[PDB]
Amino acid sequence: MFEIKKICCIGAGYVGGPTCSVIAHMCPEIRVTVVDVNESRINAWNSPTLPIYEPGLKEVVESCRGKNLFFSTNIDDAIKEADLVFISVNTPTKTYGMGKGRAADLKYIEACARRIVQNSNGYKIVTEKSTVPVRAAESIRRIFDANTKPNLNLQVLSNPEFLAEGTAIKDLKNPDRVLIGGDETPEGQRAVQALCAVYEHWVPREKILTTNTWSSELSKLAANAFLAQRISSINSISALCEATGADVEEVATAIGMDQRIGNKFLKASVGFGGSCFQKDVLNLVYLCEALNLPEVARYWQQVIDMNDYQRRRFASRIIDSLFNTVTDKKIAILGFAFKKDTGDTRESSSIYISKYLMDEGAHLHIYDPKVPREQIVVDLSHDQVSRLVTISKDPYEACDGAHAVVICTEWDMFKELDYERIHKKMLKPAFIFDGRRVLDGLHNELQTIGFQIETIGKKV
Amino acid sequence: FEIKKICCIGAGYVGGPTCSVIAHMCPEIRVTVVDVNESRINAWNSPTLPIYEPGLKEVVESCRGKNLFFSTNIDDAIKEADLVFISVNTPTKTYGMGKGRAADLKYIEACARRIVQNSNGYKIVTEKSTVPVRAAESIRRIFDANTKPNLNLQVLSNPEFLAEGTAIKDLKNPDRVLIGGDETPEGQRAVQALCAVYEHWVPREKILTTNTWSSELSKLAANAFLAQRISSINSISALCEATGADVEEVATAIGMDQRIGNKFLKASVGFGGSCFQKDVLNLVYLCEALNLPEVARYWQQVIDMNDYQRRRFASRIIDSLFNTVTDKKIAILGFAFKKDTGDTRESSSIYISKYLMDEGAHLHIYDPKVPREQIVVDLSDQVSRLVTISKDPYEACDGAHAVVICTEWDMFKELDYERIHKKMLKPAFIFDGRRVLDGLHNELQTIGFQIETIGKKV
Amino acid sequence: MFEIKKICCIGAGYVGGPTCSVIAHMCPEIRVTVVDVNESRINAWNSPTLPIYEPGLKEVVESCRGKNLFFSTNIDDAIKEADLVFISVNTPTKTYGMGKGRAADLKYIEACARRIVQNSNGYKIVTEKSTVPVRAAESIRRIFDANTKPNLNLQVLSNPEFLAEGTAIKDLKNPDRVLIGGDETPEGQRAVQALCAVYEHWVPREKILTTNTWSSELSKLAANAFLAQRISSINSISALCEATGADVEEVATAIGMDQRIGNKFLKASVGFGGSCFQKDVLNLVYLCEALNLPEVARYWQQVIDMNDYQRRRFASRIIDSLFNTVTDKKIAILGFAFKKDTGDTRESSSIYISKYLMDEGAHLHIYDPKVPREQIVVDLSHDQVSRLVTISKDPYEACDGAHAVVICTEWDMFKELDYERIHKKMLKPAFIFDGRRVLDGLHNELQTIGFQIETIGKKV
Numbered sequence A, C: 001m002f003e004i005k006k007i008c009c010i011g012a013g014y015v016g017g018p019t020c021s022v023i024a025h026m027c028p029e030i031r032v033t034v035v036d037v038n039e040s041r042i043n044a045w046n047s048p049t050l051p052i053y054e055p056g057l058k059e060v061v062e063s064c065r066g067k068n069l070f071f072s073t074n075i076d077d078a079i080k081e082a083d084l085v086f087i088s089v090n091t092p093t094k095t096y097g098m099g100k101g102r103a104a105d106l107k108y109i110e111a112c113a114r115r116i117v118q119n120s121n122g123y124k125i126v127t128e129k130s131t132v133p134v135r136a137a138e139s140i141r142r143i144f145d146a147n148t149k150p151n152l153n154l155q156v157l158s159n160p161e162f163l164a165e166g167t168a169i170k171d172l173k174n175p176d177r178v179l180i181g182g183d184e185t186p187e188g189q190r191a192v193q194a195l196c197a198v199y200e201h202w203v204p205r206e207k208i209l210t211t212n213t214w215s216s217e218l219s220k221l222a223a224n225a226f227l228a229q230r231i232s233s234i235n236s237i238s239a240l241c242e243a244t245g246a247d248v249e250e251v252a253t254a255i256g257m258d259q260r261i262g263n264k265f266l267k268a269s270v271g272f273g274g275s276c277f278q279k280d281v282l283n284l285v286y287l288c289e290a291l292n293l294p295e296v297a298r299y300w301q302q303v304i305d306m307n308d309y310q311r312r313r314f315a316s317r318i319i320d321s322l323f324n325t326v327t328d329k330k331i332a333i334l335g336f337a338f339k340k341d342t343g344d345t346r347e348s349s350s351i352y353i354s355k356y357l358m359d360e361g362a363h364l365h366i367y368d369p370k371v372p373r374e375q376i377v378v379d380l381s382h383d384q385v386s387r388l389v390t391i392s393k394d395p396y397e398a399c400d401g402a403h404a405v406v407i408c409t410e411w412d413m414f415k416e417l418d419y420e421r422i423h424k425k426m427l428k429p430a431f432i433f434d435g436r437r438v439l440d441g442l443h444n445e446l447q448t449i450g451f452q453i454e455t456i457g458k459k460v
Numbered sequence B: 001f002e003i004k005k006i007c008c009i010g011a012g013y014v015g016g017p018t019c020s021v022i023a024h025m026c027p028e029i030r031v032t033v034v035d036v037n038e039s040r041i042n043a044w045n046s047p048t049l050p051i052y053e054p055g056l057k058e059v060v061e062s063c064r065g066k067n068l069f070f071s072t073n074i075d076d077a078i079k080e081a082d083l084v085f086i087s088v089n090t091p092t093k094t095y096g097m098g099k100g101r102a103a104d105l106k107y108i109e110a111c112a113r114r115i116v117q118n119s120n121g122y123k124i125v126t127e128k129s130t131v132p133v134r135a136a137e138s139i140r141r142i143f144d145a146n147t148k149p150n151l152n153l154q155v156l157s158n159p160e161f162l163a164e165g166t167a168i169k170d171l172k173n174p175d176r177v178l179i180g181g182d183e184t185p186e187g188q189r190a191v192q193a194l195c196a197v198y199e200h201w202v203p204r205e206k207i208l209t210t211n212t213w214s215s216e217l218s219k220l221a222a223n224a225f226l227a228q229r230i231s232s233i234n235s236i237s238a239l240c241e242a243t244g245a246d247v248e249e250v251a252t253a254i255g256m257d258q259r260i261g262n263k264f265l266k267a268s269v270g271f272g273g274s275c276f277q278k279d280v281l282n283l284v285y286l287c288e289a290l291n292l293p294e295v296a297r298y299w300q301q302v303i304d305m306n307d308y309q310r311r312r313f314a315s316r317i318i319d320s321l322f323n324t325v326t327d328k329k330i331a332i333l334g335f336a337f338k339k340d341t342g343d344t345r346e347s348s349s350i351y352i353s354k355y356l357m358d359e360g361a362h363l364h365i366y367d368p369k370v371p372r373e374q375i376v377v378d379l380s381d382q383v384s385r386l387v388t389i390s391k392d393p394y395e396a397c398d399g400a401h402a403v404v405i406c407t408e409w410d411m412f413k414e415l416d417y418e419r420i421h422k423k424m425l426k427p428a429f430i431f432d433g434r435r436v437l438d439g440l441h442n443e444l445q446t447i448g449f450q451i452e453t454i455g456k457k458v
């Protein structure tokens, strides 16, 4: 059986950095080198201030860095020396050309495939961790086959990642499962077992699934679609609850106690964000169209359409509640990250809600405990941002003279704010729009203070 | 207040089993199940029950005549009752306003009127039937308009979550019990009295209490979520066939995420049963009424996907058989909507059969539990010319071009496929709409079958 | 090299009878037997009154029948003894089930394939002359492979037919080309060559095309589509001519003098009929949808949609011209055949125009020199036919007390009728609607007599 002792990971982002840190942590006899074209990002990984915020990550990195974990811009030498090469680069939705707004952009994957074969001799296992369309591994195999050399044997595997940001270290150290796809061939199965042996340093063999490459690729897309669907489903129930006078939290409990349904991922919200759910569902939708499966495409499209509607209707609830006009009105936005326990803003509902209110000419004052002010400015930019956006140092500044407080991210602190103080300095009537249900069981207290408090999944 | 006599209006798949379990678990409570259908009631009182449900016969026989009764005497049962369950059918309307979408509430209203005509004193009236949101209000309003001195009728909601085939297990060990009633003192005293019945065998922590309209919405939502899981995995099955992935491998990968869970990810020709479609349509119909067109279109997809899965399965059979099935003998194995039941209501088997009958195929249908008279009714001329009901599966496959498995009965995987092949016309096809032949494909191919299944590429 | 000495043809219709008649005529050393389930049809083929009207056919049949041409209902023995079996059974559009109104119905084809394999031993060539969807020959091959016998060796070819009814004998004796499809394998090419050898008794080798079975099948569908398209195209121009004061016959001449366009099939009409154009084009459209080609599907659907419009707008013109009401009005329909020189009515525009007028309650009196009166009854039946339809022994009976005369088939005789006499006994104002342009150059005389004369592609 083949022993992997040098790993190169191309892409030092939210997947590459944490995944490799944990491998290095659990496998002291393997040298793990994380590489990237982004020099500032690599430099930050090698510093006391990491380029991303992830609970527990700093402790894992500092235990290994310089011992068997390395971060470098020297991609070529990392590849050359590696037994196993992870492709962990970004796969954003195409914003141009064929399949604009739907198709996955594979330019970064392709650039990796080309650089690997340019710098490779002998045997390596090339492992696609990035989320890709079904059959993308076949393209990598084709690039490798077309640029073959004597004794070049590059084995291609799929090894999708299932970590959630904010819980990355926990999920990596105790994953519900690890999924690996490869050919049925002897060489394919030898590559698969080599990678299994890495994970078996800390993951039980019973929790490692092996399949073919296509099942692996699809499984990842399908898993995200099912998860995203659970959220769009409970959000659609939230709108029904508001209309009928039921409570989505109480309905969710009754639904969730059916063990066939399960009780996870039933928290209604202003809408799901994050870099992956939207793009991965749209990837699936684009694939179906391309494979003559239009019924399946319109089935999954509804997950996105419902999410977009949830956001849109939350925005219109704000504008309607504020006497149908918010032009020149100060509105506090509490939370910009796409979920708590991350500084990541990619596809955050906070962006979308902010842009809907900016379209009305509202004056937004945005606070988040973890997101850097520079990123907020970038996210809201194409000006409008200079005229309409202020980034606040604390939530009290943001609410000072506000007509409305809009909670978009479920940071623990928002529940604990001094709302009596806030009320005194808000313009009147003062509104709170809770897009996260974090103020449940404070409604009586807030109403006594004098707020009009509105939340998703509860009738006004 | 202690409930000592229970009446249940509706002696069907819900009223019969629910009451039988109540009687079995509460020997001090007299439970009377009533119905307008005399022959159904007569069957409940016979050695051959009107429905097939595992474990039901043994429960009925342990209580019937002691504290469990089946009767067409609806009036006296209501008169004497402390608690009256409403457990009549709520089919989709096949006429008028909301044809093909809205719930038909004529049987519910008939119950409400009969109760108020035959009641004096205090009673708790509990709607267990799956009804639109705010339906319990209509019963309340009927009662308030028809008061009598010392008449005090309390209205609750108590949705049912059992699945047919597993009814007795589900009833004896429910994941939860859901009860809705008014926030008033009288309302809460009614709710507590019903809780007290369930607490003879159900832990109090598993009993959820709320208002009638939240209870009603929860039932419709739970069914929509369940149906959605099936439509979702069925949508993935189509993708698998197109990409060389295997839906069972994909389902396993998906299901190991504990946030997703591993239940209800079995791909099929399509979900059947009297309730999933009609309850999703009820929910969709409500959305339109409430000005929620986006929510309506979201949930409509669960139904549109199910209809596509069935349609493409039928089209696969016709295409594989050289684009013509006119006069071709074809075996339908499984007519029940799932295994462990004789119930055929909305079975995918009915839809597939009708598609093949539309082509003029000669169907030979076999099911171990569905009565032959029910299959004739479901498919109903065209039935006389095209449909034969087979006593056994070998009769069904004799001289057939294709074998179509629609119901996951255990016996179909255990058949002698060498024997079947010998007397089939050639080429011989098997279309496995339940994935019950997995891991026999190599053997079946070597025998000479073209074998096709959902979620696997041909 | 294999010599075909006995031919069996299954299907004694407008293809099977004439095609076999000509083979026998040109190949006196080959025994040719045409078979059919329709006993009265076979009986007629053996009588002095043939079951179809086709110029020159009677002479060809009588020069060979009883010598090397036979017609029989003994299908089994004819298959058993044949070296070559033609399948020339009907392939109508399905009126039921999957693909209703679009897909080809292949039940008759399959009945033939099954009958051939059960009655065959040794070597035979099986040739699909019926017009079939692409890949239909693959289905026959599969049926044969699944039902082997020791020594049985059946080879499958495509050999589409290109004859037009009314000119079948000329078309068969001097075809523009012969098309044969077969497998690239040695056995298939020996099969293909054997069939060529038959045709080479009277067709130049240069005019015989050979290919695979699917390119052959597709070429036949495509050829009919291109033909039907020229007619719908000139008919579209006929509508424009009426609207702009141009004449479609002069525009057709000008267009047709471009040798790249060519001057055939540019005769505007009420619309194309015949058993094949519509069904063959719809077959093509259905195939497109199955192959995920919706653009190609809508492209060819326009040929049919234009034809439907040409018919409808001609019926509307009659109704609008007759003061917007034809209930109880006697109207003469001259010509029921789908074109001249045939007794065939299948998909005749005369059927459609009749049905539109019957839907109004008009009293139709129908005349055709060749079509049997019982076929006209059958065609207009779903009663209505009893109440509204009279079949006339001569055209003057049809026009007697009529309000309008509608020419739907281009029989030479209609141009030659005594229109002064017709006018005297018609109701007034008397109308002529020429759906075939056979009355061109008579418009001045007709108007002088008193008729309002209207025609396709000429402004009123």
Ligand SMILES: NC(=O)C1=CN([C@@H]2O[C@H](COP(=O)(O)OP(=O)(O)OC[C@H]3O[C@@H](n4cnc5c(N)ncnc54)[C@H](O)[C@@H]3O)[C@@H](O)[C@H]2O)C=CC1
Binding pocket: A010, A011, A012, A013, A014, A015, A016, A035, A036, A037, A038, A041, A075, A088, A089, A090, A091, A108, A109, A111, A112, A129, A130, A131, A132, A161, A162, A163, A164, A165, A275, A276
């Ligand atoms: N963020 C998440 O929670 C998870 C993401 N995924 C998937 O993992 C992949 C990566 O996601 P993230 O790490 O969030 O993206 P990211 O954008 O944060 O990181 C990707 C990194 O790859 C680098 N890169 C791109 N092309 C390169 C090249 N040719 N050579 C060297 N470096 C290159 C970029 O500079 C960037 O730093 C995606 O395919 C995503 O769908 C999977 C599971 C979790």
Ligand SMILES: NC(=O)C1=CN([C@@H]2O[C@H](COP(=O)(O)OP(=O)(O)OC[C@H]3O[C@@H](n4cnc5c(N)ncnc54)[C@H](O)[C@@H]3O)[C@@H](O)[C@H]2O)C=CC1
Binding pocket: B009, B010, B011, B012, B013, B014, B015, B034, B035, B036, B037, B040, B074, B087, B088, B089, B090, B107, B108, B110, B111, B128, B129, B130, B131, B160, B161, B162, B163, B164, B274, B275
């Ligand atoms: N079948 C199932 O697995 C479950 C059904 N439900 C719900 O339970 C309700 C009943 O379902 P089933 O038992 O399947 O229906 P069913 O049709 O099998 O039985 C209902 C019975 O009520 C009787 N009935 C109708 N009107 C009556 C009246 N006015 N007086 C006396 N009897 C009358 C009918 O004759 C029938 O026998 C429905 O609302 C359904 O949605 C809920 C959970 C499970």
Ligand SMILES: NC(=O)C1=CN([C@@H]2O[C@H](COP(=O)(O)OP(=O)(O)OC[C@H]3O[C@@H](n4cnc5c(N)ncnc54)[C@H](O)[C@@H]3O)[C@@H](O)[C@H]2O)C=CC1
Binding pocket: C010, C011, C012, C013, C014, C015, C016, C035, C036, C037, C038, C041, C075, C088, C089, C090, C091, C108, C109, C111, C112, C129, C130, C131, C132, C161, C162, C163, C164, C165, C275, C276
């Ligand atoms: N009519 C035309 O101008 C042309 C027709 N074609 C094609 O040729 C085929 C036949 O056309 P037609 O001769 O007009 O059809 P048709 O309907 O006039 O004749 C077909 C004959 O086949 C017989 N038949 C059907 N099933 C049979 C079976 N199982 N055993 C024995 N006989 C059977 C019918 O009884 C009928 O007499 C069609 O596929 C058509 O598309 C091709 C070129 C020209």
Ligand SMILES: O=c1ccn([C@@H]2O[C@H](COP(=O)(O)OP(=O)(O)O[C@H]3O[C@H](CO)[C@@H](O)[C@H](O)[C@H]3O)[C@@H](O)[C@H]2O)c(=O)[nH]1
Binding pocket: A131, A161, A162, A163, A164, A165, A166, A224, A227, A231, A264, A265, A266, A267, A268, A269, A271, A272, A273, A274, A275, A276, A277, A338, A339, A340
């Ligand atoms: O019940 C819920 C659960 C989540 N969300 C929101 O949904 C989005 C996604 O949350 P989460 O799934 O927890 O984080 P992600 O980092 O997006 O992780 C998802 O996306 C990853 C990248 O593909 C996968 O690896 C993970 O398994 C999958 O959970 C966030 O905006 C959450 O606030 C809700 O609104 N309600």
Ligand SMILES: O=c1ccn([C@@H]2O[C@H](COP(=O)(O)OP(=O)(O)O[C@H]3O[C@H](CO)[C@@H](O)[C@H](O)[C@H]3O)[C@@H](O)[C@H]2O)c(=O)[nH]1
Binding pocket: B130, B160, B161, B162, B163, B164, B165, B223, B226, B230, B263, B264, B265, B266, B267, B268, B270, B271, B272, B273, B274, B275, B276, B337, B338, B339
């Ligand atoms: O993974 C799965 C699970 C189910 N089914 C099919 O879905 C239909 C319904 O199955 P099931 O839910 O097991 O039975 P039902 O009797 O229809 O029970 C449903 O409907 C009842 C009436 O509302 C509810 O009370 C139950 O909780 C709910 O499961 C049947 O055709 C099943 O074969 C699948 O195809 N795949």
Ligand SMILES: O=c1ccn([C@@H]2O[C@H](COP(=O)(O)OP(=O)(O)O[C@H]3O[C@H](CO)[C@@H](O)[C@H](O)[C@H]3O)[C@@H](O)[C@H]2O)c(=O)[nH]1
Binding pocket: C131, C161, C162, C163, C164, C165, C166, C224, C227, C231, C264, C265, C266, C267, C268, C269, C271, C272, C273, C274, C275, C276, C277, C338, C339, C340
């Ligand atoms: O310029 C024209 C030519 C034809 N037609 C009408 O088009 C229909 C078809 O005419 P035609 O093609 O001459 O006779 P078909 O017997 O239908 O022959 C066609 O259909 C056959 C069956 O496939 C093919 O084999 C022939 O090549 C093809 O011409 C008839 O209603 C004609 O009157 C016109 O209106 N204008």
Ligand SMILES: [Cl-]
Binding pocket: A369, A411, A412, A413, A414
């Ligand atoms: Cl916080």
Ligand SMILES: [Cl-]
Binding pocket: B368, B409, B410, B411, B412
């Ligand atoms: Cl069984």
Ligand SMILES: [Cl-]
Binding pocket: C369, C411, C412, C413, C414
């Ligand atoms: Cl003539």
